[PDB]
Amino acid sequence: PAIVCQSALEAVSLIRSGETLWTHSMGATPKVLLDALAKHALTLDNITLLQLHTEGAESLSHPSLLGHLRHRCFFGGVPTRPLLQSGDADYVPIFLSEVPKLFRSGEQKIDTAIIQVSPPDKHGMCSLGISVEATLAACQVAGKIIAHINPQMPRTHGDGFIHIDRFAAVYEQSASLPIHSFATGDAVSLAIGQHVAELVRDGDCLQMGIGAIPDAVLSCLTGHKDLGVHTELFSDGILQLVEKGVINNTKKRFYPGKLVTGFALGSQKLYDYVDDNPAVIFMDIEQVNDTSIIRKNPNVMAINSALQVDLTGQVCADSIGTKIYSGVGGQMDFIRGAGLSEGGRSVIALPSTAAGGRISRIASVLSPGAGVVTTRAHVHYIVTEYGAANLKGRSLRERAQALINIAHPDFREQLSRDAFEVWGLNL
Amino acid sequence: PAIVCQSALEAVSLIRSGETLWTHSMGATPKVLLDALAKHALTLDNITLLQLHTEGAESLSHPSLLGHLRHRCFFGGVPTRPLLQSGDADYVPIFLSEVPKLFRSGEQKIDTAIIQVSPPDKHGMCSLGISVEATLAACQVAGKIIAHINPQMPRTHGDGFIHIDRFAAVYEQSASLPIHSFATGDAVSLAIGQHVAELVRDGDCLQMGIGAIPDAVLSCLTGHKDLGVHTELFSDGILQLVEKGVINNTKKRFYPGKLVTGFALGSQKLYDYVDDNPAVIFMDIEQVNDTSIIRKNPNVMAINSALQVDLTGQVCADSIGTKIYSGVGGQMDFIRGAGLSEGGRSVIALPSTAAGGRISRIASVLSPGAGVVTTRAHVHYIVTEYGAANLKGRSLRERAQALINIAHPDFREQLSRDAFEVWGLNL
Numbered sequence: 001p002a003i004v005c006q007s008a009l010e011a012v013s014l015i016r017s018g019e020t021l022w023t024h025s026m027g028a029t030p031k032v033l034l035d036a037l038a039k040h041a042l043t044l045d046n047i048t049l050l051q052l053h054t055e056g057a058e059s060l061s062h063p064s065l066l067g068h069l070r071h072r073c074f075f076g077g078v079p080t081r082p083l084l085q086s087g088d089a090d091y092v093p094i095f096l097s098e099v100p101k102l103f104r105s106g107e108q109k110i111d112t113a114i115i116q117v118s119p120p121d122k123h124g125m126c127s128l129g130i131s132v133e134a135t136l137a138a139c140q141v142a143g144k145i146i147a148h149i150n151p152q153m154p155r156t157h158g159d160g161f162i163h164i165d166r167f168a169a170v171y172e173q174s175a176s177l178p179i180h181s182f183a184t185g186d187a188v189s190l191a192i193g194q195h196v197a198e199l200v201r202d203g204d205c206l207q208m209g210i211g212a213i214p215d216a217v218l219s220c221l222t223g224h225k226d227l228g229v230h231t232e233l234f235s236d237g238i239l240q241l242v243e244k245g246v247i248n249n250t251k252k253r254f255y256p257g258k259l260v261t262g263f264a265l266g267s268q269k270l271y272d273y274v275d276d277n278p279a280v281i282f283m284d285i286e287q288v289n290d291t292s293i294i295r296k297n298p299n300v301m302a303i304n305s306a307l308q309v310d311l312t313g314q315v316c317a318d319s320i321g322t323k324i325y326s327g328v329g330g331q332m333d334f335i336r337g338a339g340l341s342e343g344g345r346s347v348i349a350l351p352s353t354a355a356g357g358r359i360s361r362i363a364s365v366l367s368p369g370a371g372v373v374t375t376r377a378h379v380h381y382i383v384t385e386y387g388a389a390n391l392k393g394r395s396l397r398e399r400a401q402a403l404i405n406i407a408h409p410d411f412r413e414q415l416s417r418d419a420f421e422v423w424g425l426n427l
Numbered sequence: 428p429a430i431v432c433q434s435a436l437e438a439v440s441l442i443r444s445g446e447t448l449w450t451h452s453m454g455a456t457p458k459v460l461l462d463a464l465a466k467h468a469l470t471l472d473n474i475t476l477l478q479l480h481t482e483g484a485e486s487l488s489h490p491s492l493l494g495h496l497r498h499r500c501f502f503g504g505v506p507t508r509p510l511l512q513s514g515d516a517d518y519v520p521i522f523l524s525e526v527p528k529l530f531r532s533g534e535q536k537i538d539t540a541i542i543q544v545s546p547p548d549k550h551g552m553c554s555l556g557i558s559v560e561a562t563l564a565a566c567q568v569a570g571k572i573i574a575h576i577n578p579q580m581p582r583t584h585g586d587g588f589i590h591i592d593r594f595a596a597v598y599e600q601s602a603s604l605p606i607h608s609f610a611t612g613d614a615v616s617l618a619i620g621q622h623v624a625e626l627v628r629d630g631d632c633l634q635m636g637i638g639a640i641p642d643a644v645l646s647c648l649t650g651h652k653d654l655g656v657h658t659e660l661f662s663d664g665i666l667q668l669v670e671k672g673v674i675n676n677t678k679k680r681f682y683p684g685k686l687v688t689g690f691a692l693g694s695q696k697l698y699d700y701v702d703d704n705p706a707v708i709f710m711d712i713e714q715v716n717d718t719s720i721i722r723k724n725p726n727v728m729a730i731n732s733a734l735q736v737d738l739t740g741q742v743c744a745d746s747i748g749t750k751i752y753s754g755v756g757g758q759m760d761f762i763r764g765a766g767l768s769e770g771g772r773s774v775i776a777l778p779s780t781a782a783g784g785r786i787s788r789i790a791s792v793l794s795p796g797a798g799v800v801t802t803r804a805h806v807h808y809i810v811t812e813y814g815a816a817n818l819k820g821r822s823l824r825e826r827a828q829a830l831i832n833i834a835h836p837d838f839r840e841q842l843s844r845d846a847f848e849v850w851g852l853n854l
């Protein structure tokens with residue numbers, strides 16, 4: 001009983017004022033529909049849009065939407081950062097795995113979910129494609145669903161399936177999926193990649209993010225074997241190790257033989273690989289990012305990044321001071337699960353500096369109001385282009401000492417000073 | 428094959444220089460043995476003593492031990508704070524549940540464990556008594572064990588049992604157990620107790636700490652029923668609700684009908700109640716403080732405290748700035764498990780002020796270097812003598828607004844100002 005709209009605007013029309021909306025996130029962001037909402041919303045007001053990291057939705061961040069629509073972010077992105085920092089949008093800190101629960105528990109109502117799916121099959125089944133994340137949970141509690149049928153959306157295996165009769169409206173058109181290739185090789189990335197690579201043992205169950213660092217790391221694993229994959233997301237980097245036989249998920253205990261993630265992002269080759277591939281399972285973040293599940297696999301290797309780290313090991317990765325940059329996500333859950341896993345190891349990899357090399361990512365103390373995503377007690381390894389530091393079980397003076405050893409040499413002196421002047425530690 | 432020493436000094440004598448020692452913590456701190464070590468250690472050197480919160484061991488913090496023994500704290504206490512702040516002792520941040528793993532994984536070696544147990548029974552079995560915590564794990568990997576047999580130590584049920592042949596030395600004498608009655612009723616405590624009490628539903632599975640706040644809360648639960656108990660520790664407060672029938676552990680799924688904790692601390696009546704009591708189970712912190720286990724019980728109610736909270740919800744509870752006050756402990760694991768539990772709720776209860784009322788516990792931003800124990804994403808409820816604030820799913824401006832509403836009115840104006848000047852939020 002879904003209405004087959006002839007235009008995106010016709011589909012978005014059902015949205016009424018004051019409604020709380022949810023949008024498919026990541027590579028699945030319904031750009032086609034969100035652009036139509038960029039106009040339709042002009043006639044509405046009090047529209048709240050819940051979301052995670054979004055791609056190609058900068059049309060909804062145009063000043064003309066101020067007063068009609070407001071973004072409510074569980075994770076910031078390129079089109080929302082300026083709005084968050086300018087106080088025009090709202091940032092709600094929350095573990096990614098907790099998002100599905102917030103919806104299902106009814107704590108956060110959702111009037112309508114905007115999503116992008118693959119065309120319905122003989123059974124009328126569609127797929128959430130490259131992004132299952134928390135949209136599946138949103139579609140469960142959503143008052144109504146507005147779907148955009150895109151023949152380009154791959155039919156991913158796992159929990160991304162949903163029946164077309166659960167849709168109030170439907171608009172079909174082939175559109176491009178954001179390939180996202182903003183990454184780029186670098187001298188520092190290679191260095192960090194090499195260091196991390198030495199911590200990776202054969203049969204390890206990987207978990208990583210996107211970027212130069214992750215890629216550099218993956219490029220140094222072409223010699224390992226029987227590696228597994230249980231991550232929040234994956235890109236082309238992984239695809240290459242799979243075709244090399246390096247990855248086979250043979251040593252995992254939870255869904256062995258198959259790759260598991262909450263979503264994917266990368267080139268068309270990747271989307272082609274995950275498309276209707278029995279070996280790739282896109283699972284609901286409430287599970288994939290559940291420490292209780294992650295710990296089930298032995299030798300988990302969790303590799304994440306950060307924005308700022310203090311001489312004590314407190315990790316900040318969702319913001320720079322009081323200005324929100326991204327979000328909590330799920331690096332913490334993976335870092336803990338990694339510690340609970342048999343022989344598991346975690347690693348926080350980041351460049352020793354930033355802003356061109358004038359700012360040290362390893363500061364003596366976190367900037368006033370810095371959002372702590374991962375705490376002292378959580379941290380295991382921290383790597384930089386200058387080496388690795390193991391803080392597990394190490395005291396404050398031991399941690400500070402090891403950290404300043406991987407910090408850029410242009411800041412060693414300062415860091416060492418504040419080690420005693422600020423923390424009162426004598427190395 | 429244990430050696431029956433005739434004096435505490437004779438037992439401690441086996442300890443040799445350069446050894447890494449572990450001591451029973453909390454109410455089980457082997458004062459009798461530790462006082463003998465206060466002297467014997469004078470002839471040794473390079474002695475490291477790993478520990479948690481200790482009681483009555485201030486003799487080991489005497490300047491005369493500097494150079495011979497050094498404290499390595501996983502959690503600070505009264506006799507160690509001055510040493511930590513003065514850089515004479517070491518503080519190792521770590522989740523309490525992770526301590527057993529650090530020992531078992533062999534990451535942290537232990538040459539000898541000093542412990543206090545109940546006399547051996549017909550089967551030669553002794554009990555770790557009121558403190559199981561991580562000592563059980565320490566006794567597992569310890570090179571040798573030096574036990575103090577105390578007829579006053581209650582024979583607790585659970586995992587505190589150990590055979591006397593696992594001891595290298597043994598000294599027996601009846602000694603007093605620290606009753607710990609430092610708590611004291613207050614106007615603010617009562618207020619906070621009342622507010623928290625309203626969040627507690629019947630059949631809730633409680634988890635709390637010691638102090639005026641917890642007691643005030645317990646005194647307001649004399650009207651509830653079918654309450655359960657799965658906590659890090661408990662005191663006289665709980666004992667009173669048990670004899671009132673209010674607590675019966677009938678609604679728990681993990682060890683129903685029985686009280687569960689890692690340790691106990693309170694008057695002789697309490698130690699008398701737990702003594703050989705089938706209904707009270709002292710379990711290993713690796714389990715009791717395991718979020719994977721805590722979440723198994725529905726309607727978990729986790730009530731903890733804090734030292735400083737920022738307008739965003741970041742919780743600091745192990746220190747004041749860069750000076751370590753206590754430790755990470757296990758409030759985070761309980762707060763998360765509480766969120767994962769069906770209908771579970773957590774609450775961070777603390778006085779709106781401190782230092783006589785000149786310092787606001789709710790600061791616009793955490794003090795430079797403040798140890799974050801519980802993060803933004805973790806927090807659910809925060810209560811003060813002025814009410815409660817729900818941050819779950821709330822944005823930064825919503826959180827700041829709610830927080831300043833329970834902050835002492837003498838700081839509302841300042842807090843509200845920095846809400847825009849520091850965080851750039853407009854309420």
Ligand SMILES: *SCCNC(=O)CCNC(=O)[C@H](O)C(C)(C)COP(=O)(O)OP(=O)(O)OC[C@H]1O[C@@H](n2cnc3c(N)ncnc32)[C@H](O)[C@@H]1OP(=O)(O)O
Pocket residue numbers: 209211232233304305306307308317318320325326327328329330331332354355356359360361
């Ligand atoms: S499902 C997976 C989602 N994520 C998680 O679960 C955990 C959260 N992680 C993240 O958001 C990203 O992994 C972080 C920690 C941001 C690292 O990612 P990026 O690699 O994409 O970001 P950059 O390091 O390249 O930084 C972007 C800009 O900000 C500046 N900058 C970095 N660090 C600092 C510090 N400490 N102080 C001031 N500025 C800092 C850089 O200049 C950088 O510049 P651009 O021009 O924007 O590229």
Ligand SMILES: *SCCNC(=O)CCNC(=O)[C@H](O)C(C)(C)COP(=O)(O)OP(=O)(O)OC[C@H]1O[C@@H](n2cnc3c(N)ncnc32)[C@H](O)[C@@H]1OP(=O)(O)O
Pocket residue numbers: 636638659660731732733734735743744745747752753754755756757758759781782783786787788
């Ligand atoms: S196994 C369970 C143990 N705990 C955990 O797992 C979690 C960690 N928490 C704790 O150890 C305690 O719950 C904390 C958070 C310390 C609160 O406990 P206390 O109630 O015992 O401590 P007080 O609140 O009474 O504080 C002690 C002294 O320090 C001053 N003070 C408190 N807060 C501040 C701030 N924000 N700024 C400056 N000073 C502050 C008080 O004046 C207080 O005075 P005393 O005379 O020492 O009592």
